[PDB]
Amino acid sequence: NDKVRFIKDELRLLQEPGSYVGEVIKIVSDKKVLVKVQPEGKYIVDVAKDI
Amino acid sequence: VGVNKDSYLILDTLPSEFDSRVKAMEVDEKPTETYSDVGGLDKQIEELVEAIVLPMKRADKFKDMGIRAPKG
Amino acid sequence: ENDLKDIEARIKEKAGVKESDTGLAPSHLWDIMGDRQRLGEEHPLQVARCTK
Amino acid sequence: TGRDDTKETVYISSIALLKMLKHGRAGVPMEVMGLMLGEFVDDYTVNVVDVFAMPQSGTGVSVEAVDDVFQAKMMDMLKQTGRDQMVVGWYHSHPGFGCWLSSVDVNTQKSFEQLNSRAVAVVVDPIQSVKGKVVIDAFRLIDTGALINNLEPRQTTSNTGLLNKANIQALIHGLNRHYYSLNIDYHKTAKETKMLMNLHKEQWQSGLKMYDYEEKEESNLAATKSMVKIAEQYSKRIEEEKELTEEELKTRYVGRQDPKKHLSETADETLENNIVSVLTAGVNSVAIK
To answer: Which chain C residues contact residue B19 at CB under 8 A?
Structure first.
């Protein structure tokens, strides 16, 4: 049962809508972070709960 | 050619495009000063008209004589 | 001397570092026509140039 | 009291679903559209019995790319065949983008909502339906004023539903500022099941039909060799597998993918493959002569 039902949990993981890699240039203490996205431009954008 | 941007199909044909810098070449209705508001250096005016202007109009006399017209 | 070295660090770390946005005190209401300039397509415009 | 709006679930008959997919993928990336013929009964069921496609344009969707002249001719074609009921809305296919209504599409929808309030817009993603999931989501316009008064909670009353949000990003912007999305259930009959499940004429031609026996020998050779390599890898691993902490052993003596597990998958496929094949040979040889 464990073997078959992690696969069902793993479909969500595989069907992620993308990611990106960024690097934090600096924070701003408005509770947002300046991210120079590595392939892309600069966007100041909201943090999650995790960080 | 036009290609339809929703789905690439040759839609129709369009004139060939040249740069806007090359589209600045042609006249604005460019003022004329004829040969008669250029005084002095008479011999130069005659030498230019001969080189450029008359081989355009009398290209027929150039073909019958059989000469070529100059390149600049 | 080394106690001074550490506590300068600690003071910066807790205070936090930032960059503030330019503002205006006469503005405390702006979105009355913020949404008139924004909010769907009415529109900030993709810039082009005529070539022919 | 006023009129209260509440949950609905859009039941896409098996017929309707294939047509949208067929018409939509074929016309992608140019936008595809068409009307949904069906009936509303109940107060929780939008039942879409059929769809058809309205002629494509290279202006894509537009309020004037709907085209009622074509709608009218088509309606009379269903009328003569005794299939007309009520047009229950419109669908359109965004190409490879998500399910969300465009600003233009909101105004296309506002028109059909006048004609019947229970009309939906069904946004289809065909280039994303080639997964193991078919991606289709449904929307239905709600009055802007109603959203101010907090009447999005109203739409989920009297069941727990199967409530889940399959897509956000542009979707959750448009929900917030316009619409109430619907979940999608499928209707099909017991006849239609049998039609769908059947997909081969070789159902009875697949255990008497066999593959060339050179191909089988190649396969046995390939299989045995592969497991021979995995066994050497396993043997390196199982020189220890006896110290404290499983995780330390997995790094150190590669149990990265577990050569035990890896050998089990490979063993089991070719073992099962050979039992069928021998059984096919022995059936034909004895029975036929």
So the answer is: 51
